[PDB]
Structures are given as C-alpha cells and as structure tokens.
C-alpha cells in the first residue's frame with residue numbers, strides 16, 4: 001500500500017513548502033547591496049523600479065496609498081468595495097497628482113490599478129474604469145480556475161486589450177496558471193488562503209503552501225513570459241526575497257502596509273498605543289452569510305516611504321548574499337529546506353530584546 | 363515533477379539540520395572523562411588546550427576577556443568597532459600581561475587575535491595590528507564568498523602570511539569553503555545566521571542550518587588540513603560536542619561569554635536580578651540603515667573560569683560517552699536524527715525544577 | 725484505509741471524531757467518507773441535553789466522553 | 798450639631814455618607830438623625846444601574862461619585 005494510506009499514489013499529490021520551511025543559500029557574489037537592481041516586470045509591458053504592489057483591500061489601498069506606492073516605485077490597486085463612480089473618481093485623483101523612482105506612463109503620469117469582479121455589473125465597472133484612464137485591471141477572484149473568471153479575462157483581453165493589462169485572479173496550481181495563460185492574461189496572481197486575515201484554509205480546508213504554489217505557477221507561466229505575482233502571507237523582507245527567488249516577479253503586500261498612515265481609516269488608541277483596522281474583503285463587515293475572513297487591528301507604523309525603504313534594503317541584502325545583479329538572477333537562486341528547530345534558530349533566541357530594530361519586531 | 367514543486371530537482375538543494383535535530387550515539391569506550399585530551403587545532407599552526415574562542419563583538423571581547431580566555435586555555439579575538447590605535451593598544455595590553463593550560467607563544471607571551479574588515483582602511487588596520495604584535499588576523503565579514511573578502515585574504519597572506527595566521531570570514535556552503543581554502547586561508551569560519559542576536563535569516567532570508575553547514579565545509583577543508591571554526595548558535599556544552607563531532611575543530615562563543623564579569627560593560631539590576639548588555643555587531647547602535655542584529659541583555663553569570671570549566675566538563679563527558687581519546691577521535695562520532703518529540707524528551711520534562719544546576723538553565 | 729476496503733462493496737464509511745471545523749468535514753468527505761459524525765461541535769448547541777453553566781459571565785455546557793469515569797458509572 | 802439646630806423646630810435630619818454597617822445606621826439614628834441615606838451599601842445590588850463586572854471569578858459593579866471626572870463630563 002501507499003505509505004500514507006490507501007492504494008492511490010496520487011491522492012496526496014505533493015508535500016507543500018511555505019516561506020518558513022526554506023532558506024536562501026548564499027552563492028559567489030560580486031554585488032554590493034547598494035548597487036543591486038531591484039527592477040522587475042509587473043506585467044508583460046509594465047516594469048516597476050520596486051517590485052511591490054499594494055493589496056486591493058478597503059483598508060489598505062485608496063487614492064493616497066496608490067499615489068504613495070506609485071511615487072515609491074511600485075503600484076497601488078484600488079479596491080472594488082466602492083460604487084463605480086467613486087472608484088473612477090479615485091482613479092482620476094491618482095492620475096491627476098523627491099521621488100526619482102516614481103512609476104510613470106508615456107504621458108508622464110503616475111500609474112494606477114483597479115480591481116473588478118466577474119459579471120455584467122463588473123463589466124460595466126471595468127468599462128467605466130478603463131474610460132477613466134486606468135492602466136491595469138485585476139480580475140480579483142478567490143478561485144480563478146472557475147470558467148466564469150476565465151471567460152471574463154478573455155472578454156477583457158478581447159475588448160480593452162490594446163489599452164490596459166489584464167491580470168488574472170488567484171491560483172495555486174500549475175493547471176490553473178496554464179488555463180489563465182491560455183485565456184490571455186498578462187500576469188498571474190498566486191495564493192489561496194495564505195493571507196494573514198484569511199480563514200479559507202480553515203472554513204473550507206482548501207489551499208496550498210505559498211512557495212510550492214509559486215514554483216508550480218512559474219513552471220506553468222515562464223515559457224510564455226507571463227509574470228507571477230505572489231499575493232498573501234508575506235510578513236518580513238526575507239519573505240519577499242524568498243518569494244522572488246522561488247520564481248515570482250512581483251509581490252503584493254497586505255498587513256505590512258495596512259498600519260501605515262497612507263492606508264485609509266482612523267487611528268485607534270488602545271492602552272496608550274496606536275493601531276488601525278485591518279480586515280479581509282471576505283470578512284462579514286466588508287461583505288455587508290459564510291465569511292472567509294476576519295476583522296482585526298494592526299499596530300501603527302508611519303509613513304509608507306520608510307517601510308518600503310526597509311523592505312527594499314532587506315531585498316538588496318538578499319541579492320548581495322545570493323550574488324544577484326538583477327531580479328532575473330535572483331530567480332535562479334537555490335533553497336535549503338529546514339526543520340522547526342532550524343526555524344527557531346533563524347529568529348533571535350535566548351535574548352531579551354530591550355530596543356526595537358527598524359526592520360524587525362517579535 | 364518534484365514533490366516540493368516545479369521541474370527542477372535542484373531548486374531545494376538539501377535538507378539542513380541544526381544542533382537541536384541530532385544526538386551523539388554512544389559507542390564502545392575505554393576513556394575516562396577526566397583523562398580525555400581536549401586539545402585541538404585553531405589554525406594550521408596554533409593549537410589550543412581548550413578548543414574555545416571568544417567572539418569579536420563590542421560587548422564580548424576586550425583586553426580583559428582576551429587575557430582571561432588565553433589563561434583559561436582558549437583565545438580571544440578583539441572586536442574592530444574601535445579606533446585602530448585603540449585596538450593596537452588593546453593588543454599590546456594583552457601581550458604585556460594556576461593557569462597550567464594557558465596558551466602562549468614561543469616567547470611565553472599570551473596569544474591573542476584581532477578582527478579586520480575589507481578595504482584599504484582595513485589594510486591599514488591590519489598592518490598596524492601586525493606591527494603591534496597580533497598572533498592571528500580574522501577577516502571578519504558576513505558573506506565570505508564575496509570577491510573582495512577573498513582578495514583581502516589573499517593580500518594578507520601574501521604580505522604577512524609568514525608572521526600571522528589569516529582566518530577567513532563566515533561561510534555556509536562547500537563551494538565558499540573551497541574558495542576560501544584556495545585563496546590561502548589558514549582557517550575557515552562557518553555560520554551565517556545562527557547567532558542568538560542575528561536577524562539575517564529574517565531580514566534577508568539567507569542562511570543554512572549549522573550542522574549541515576559544518577559538514578559541508580569540512581567536506582572541503584579536511585582534505586587540505588584546514589581547520590573549521592563553528593561560530594554562532596551554541597547554547598549548551600552538548601552543542602559544542604555536536605559541532606566538534608560534525609567536523610569542526612573549535613567553537614567561537616557569543617552569548618555564552620557575554621554575561622560573565624570579564625566581558626566589557628556594566629552590571630544592570632532589574633527586579634533584584636543581574637543582567638548585562640549584549641548586542642549584535644550589525645545592530646543599529648553597533649553600526650552607528652538596514653541592521654541585521656538586535657540589542658538586548660543576558661543574565662549575569664560570573665567569572666569566566668567557572669563557565670569554561672563547566673563547558674569543558676560537558677565536552678569531556680561527551681568524549682567519554684563516545685569513546686574518543688582525542689578531539690580527532692571525536693570528529694568521527696555518528697549522529698542520530700530526532701524529531702520534535704525527541705527534543706522534548708532530551709530536555710527535562712514533567713518536572714518543576716526548584717534549584718538551578720551549574721550547567722543547565724530552564 | 726477503510727475506504728480502500730469498503731468502496732468495492734458499496735458500503736459507506738462514516739468519519740467519527742476529531743472534527744472541529746467545516747474544512748475538516750470537507751477533508752473527511754474528500755478522503756472517501758460519505759458522512760461525518762459530530763461531537764463537541766453540537767455539544768454546545770441549545771438542543772443538546774444539559775443545563776447551562778455560567779462561568780465569569782459566559783455560557784458553557786457540559787461535555788464528557790462515554791468512557792469517562794462519570795459516564796461509565 | 799445639626800440636631801441641636803433642628804430639633805426645636807421639628808425639622809428632621811438625614812445622615813448622608815460614611816455608613817458601612819448597620820451599627821453605623823444605629824449610631825446615626827441615636828445621635829439624633831431620623832433617616833439615613835445609603836451609597837456604597839446599595840451600589841452593589843441587582844436593582845442598582847450598571848452592568849456586572851467579572852474579575853478573577855468574582856462579581857462587582859461600578860461605583861463613582863457625582864463630583865468625579867467621569868460623572869461631571
């Protein structure tokens with residue numbers, strides 16, 4: 001019999017690795033961290049100076065956050081939890097608005113992104129957003145291997161292909177990424193359940209660990225040149241370095257940017273400290289059922305520029321350790337799989353911390 | 363495909379083991395622990411009676427610590443966070459100064475070592491230290507597979523290779539150790555991340571578990587007779603025994619020696635208990651940016667001699683268990699891999715310890 | 725293992741014990757089981773036997789195994 | 798003193814504040830008072846306004862003065 005039970009060797013397909021299961025192996029390096037080139041292709045036509053994209057969530061990205069992310073070298077994606085006219089107004093506000101790395105189009109204006117669903121109402125929203133000058137559309141769905149999501153992606157590529165870039169929803173397998181690539185998507189977003197606010201892997205018991213999912217999606221997408229975006233489950237800059245090394249071209253950040261000042265919402269004072277609200281788009285409050293997210297609060301951090309600077313410094317240090325001149329070389333790095341004891345050895349241990357580092361906290 | 367994902371069987375190169383994942387197997391023994399010989403090679407020409415070295419940290423080793431370590435049978439390495447004239451003065455102070463195991467040169471003077479960086483200013487500091495009477499130069503870096511570190515090691519060995527011994531920076535792979543040996547290093551230090559105060563494996567996500575790294579480095583250094591020093595991650599004398607059995611010849615100690623009276627710094631009182639500062643060299647305060655260390659405090663221990671005696675007693679017990687007359691015989695002991703339950707069983711369990719033992723802390 | 729022997733004869737398999745979430749039910753059904761039997765998930769409902777218990781202002785209900793000392797007496 | 802002022806004219810005196818036991822009420826009535834006004838002795842009953850506070854397995858209720866900062870705001 002099969003060692004794990006039954007007579008079917010393909011019942012348990014594979015062992016899945018996540019960010020905490022692997023470490024990057026140092027290699028022969030001739031690269032100073034300051035000279036590392038952290039530019040990467042977000043889509044087949046858009047290249048960012050910093051490969052970080054803000055999450056399309058109602059407590060993460062709005063006009064201010066989108067403008068700040070575009071100025072810092074990345075991009076912001078406005079959420080679709082607003083009326084269509086309001087979303088178009090936010091797109092116009094971003095496009096209408098020191099920062100040498102800022103992302104700009106052929107007209108010299110900042111780049112913005114918008115998220116739409118699936119359906120005729122979503123089609124009207126997408127048409128309104130495209131008419132307002134949006135550059136990239138995201139078909140933001142929880143299960144992108146559904147036939148409706150693929151049909152919507154094909155429709156958008158057929159209609160507004162010459163003017164915008166269409167990014168498919170979340171996938172976690174090789175077959176889903178291949179289907180999205182065949183459907184005509186310009187970029188594939190990866191991750192089902194690893195988000196810090198998600199309960200999908202608990203409520204439905206469905207998902208896949210992020211590192212293995214990224215590897216599978218890259219094996220499905222790289223021959224066609226389609227970029228891969230790692231979405232959800234990133235907590236440190238080492239996580240971003242690992243996600244890029246596993247094959248992803250861009251990383252989408254949630255809770256790391258929710259505690260910044262540019263994020264929408266009011267500051268909450270609790271017990272002499274500061275926080276702000278963070279919740280999933282599938283949470284009960286956001287969808288007003290069977291929710292697949294939770295509501296919570298993250299500690300307050302400050303300006304987005306400092307956070308992006310620290311994350312980029314960590315990524316530059318990783319590139320220096322691996323000897324990667326560009327991201328295209330960082331994607332050829334190798335991993336070492338570690339156990340739980342190795343995981344606790346990686347973090348600071350046997351020490352009582354008396355002052356916090358800019359890039360680390362418990 | 364690969365069970366962890368993708369089509370490349372070499373993406374996840376190996377499975378790394380740390381000190382907590384293995385145990386030493388007992389063997390036929392004719393060795394009394396009190397009759398074991400713990401002498402081991404530091405470099406190709408320097409043999410220590412106690413195979414322990416002190417870390418080059420601004421909270422661990424200064425003149426007093428170097429003198430105490432040399433008297434106890436080991437050696438000290440002065441940190442390079444000091445002005446060049448000040449470090450040369452510390453070297454002269456150590457050389458200017460019951461202890462049957464004390465390590466001394468051919469002129470009856472206590473041995474000492476000093477850490478240098480990479481660069482032309484580092485060259486000036488190294489030449490000053492050599493002219494001031496240092497016994498070994500440690501090219502102290504974080505990534506020794508960089509071209510600059512190898513060039514610096516080659517230059518030092520070409521200039522003052524007949525007067526001093528050159529020890530290369532920290533490596534974590536077989537290729538890096540082979541490159542350091544080819545460059546002309548007298549000894550190779552191993553460990554990138556295991557440090558109790560380090561955050562390199564979190565900020566950059568780069569490293570390797572210590573046991574696998576030591577085995578890989580020994581696989582490249584032993585055929586050429588180059589000693590290997592295990593640096594970082596050691597919390598018990600059993601860890602020292604495991605590191606020696608993996609192939610290392612000496613173990614450099616950090617936090618284990620940072621709480622003794624001979625370590626630089628002042629006593630601190632918190633709720634009737636004694637602590638003292640311990641911070642990483644890549645921490646924010648130490649480099650005064652993207653730090654790769656933290657600042658904290660460790661409980662006060664006392665005289666260095668008692669700590670060294672306890673560690674050597676544990677090592678002698680391990681040598682007696684494995685039937686190793688010498689460290690060279692300990693370097694051929696076998697390992698058994700354990701699970702998390704095995705690690706829980708190795709420590710005291712289902713007990714409420716009421717009095718602290720000299721060699722174990724809960 | 726049980727489904728590997730029960731499926732050829734058309735005998736259904738019931739997964740009993742250890743289920744704490746709906747994802748666990750989905751995993752049990754996907755492994756070959758046809759139904760799931762629930763314990764503590766339904767022990768705190770209003771329809772289960774037993775009086776309510778109040779601890780620190782919150783509501784609880786008693787739950788014990790049939791092999792427990794009290795239940796086997 | 799108040800009773801010395803009020804008794805000849807037949808005006809009753811109400812003792813208000815500081816009572817913690819029934820003996821205190823008896824002492825106040827013996828001193829010349831006619832009735833007693835109770836504070837903390839009735840602030841912990843069910844009929845008193847407020848919500849039960851649960852701490853360390855014991856029940857409390859909130860009690861504050863009208864001159865307190867949180868009651869004058």
Ligand SMILES: NC(=O)c1ccc[n+]([C@@H]2O[C@H](COP(=O)([O-])OP(=O)(O)OC[C@H]3O[C@@H](n4cnc5c(N)ncnc54)[C@H](O)[C@@H]3O)[C@@H](O)[C@H]2O)c1
Pocket residue numbers: 029031032033317318319320321418479480502503504505506508509510511532553554555556560562643644654
């Ligand atoms: N052993 C470790 O894992 C580790 C990690 C961080 C810091 N440290 C300690 O902190 C101090 C300073 O460390 P440092 O090495 O950054 O000193 P440093 O800034 O003086 O660097 C010296 C040389 O190391 C190499 N180097 C270091 N980090 C590199 C990277 N990320 N990518 C490429 N090359 C790199 C370069 O050749 C550089 O010129 C030392 O005392 C060191 O032991 C150690």
Ligand SMILES: *c1nc2c(ncn2[C@@H]2O[C@H](COP(=O)(O)O)[C@@H](O)[C@H]2O)c(=O)[nH]1
Pocket residue numbers: 055056057170193194195196197198199200231232233234252253254255256279280281282283292293294
């Ligand atoms: C699960 N996942 C959810 C929900 N809303 C958004 N998301 C996903 O999480 C990502 C961010 O996760 P972090 O780990 O916090 O960075 C988002 O980009 C989105 O893909 C939800 O309700 N449940």
Ligand SMILES: *c1nc2c(ncn2[C@@H]2O[C@H](COP(=O)(O)O)[C@@H](O)[C@H]2O)c(=O)[nH]1
Pocket residue numbers: 417418419532555556557558559560561562593594595596614615616617618642643644645654655656
């Ligand atoms: C990471 N590692 C660092 C830093 N400064 C020094 N080190 C290394 O750690 C060792 C200490 O190990 P312990 O586990 O504390 O015994 C040192 O000897 C050195 O090699 C730093 O900032 N980050």
Ligand SMILES: *c1nc2c(ncn2[C@@H]2O[C@H](COP(=O)(O)O)[C@@H](O)[C@H]2O)c(=O)[nH]1
Pocket residue numbers: 740741742743761762763764765788789790791792
């Ligand atoms: C062990 N198992 C016992 C006992 N009484 C009943 N059971 C089993 O547990 C199931 C419920 O498990 P939950 O995880 O609580 O859902 C029951 O259906 C029964 O099969 C006992 O004393 N010991």
Ligand SMILES: *c1nc2c(ncn2[C@@H]2O[C@H](COP(=O)(O)O)[C@@H](O)[C@H]2O)c(=O)[nH]1
Pocket residue numbers: 813814815816834835836837838861862863864865
């Ligand atoms: C002082 N006295 C205050 C305040 N609010 C009310 N009072 C007086 O105290 C009586 C309560 O006495 P207990 O000892 O609690 O029985 C009240 O009846 C009232 O006369 C205040 O803020 N400061």
Ligand SMILES: [K+]
Pocket residue numbers: 345346347348349555556557558559560561563
């Ligand atoms: K560490």
Ligand SMILES: [K+]
Pocket residue numbers: 707708709710711
């Ligand atoms: K034990």
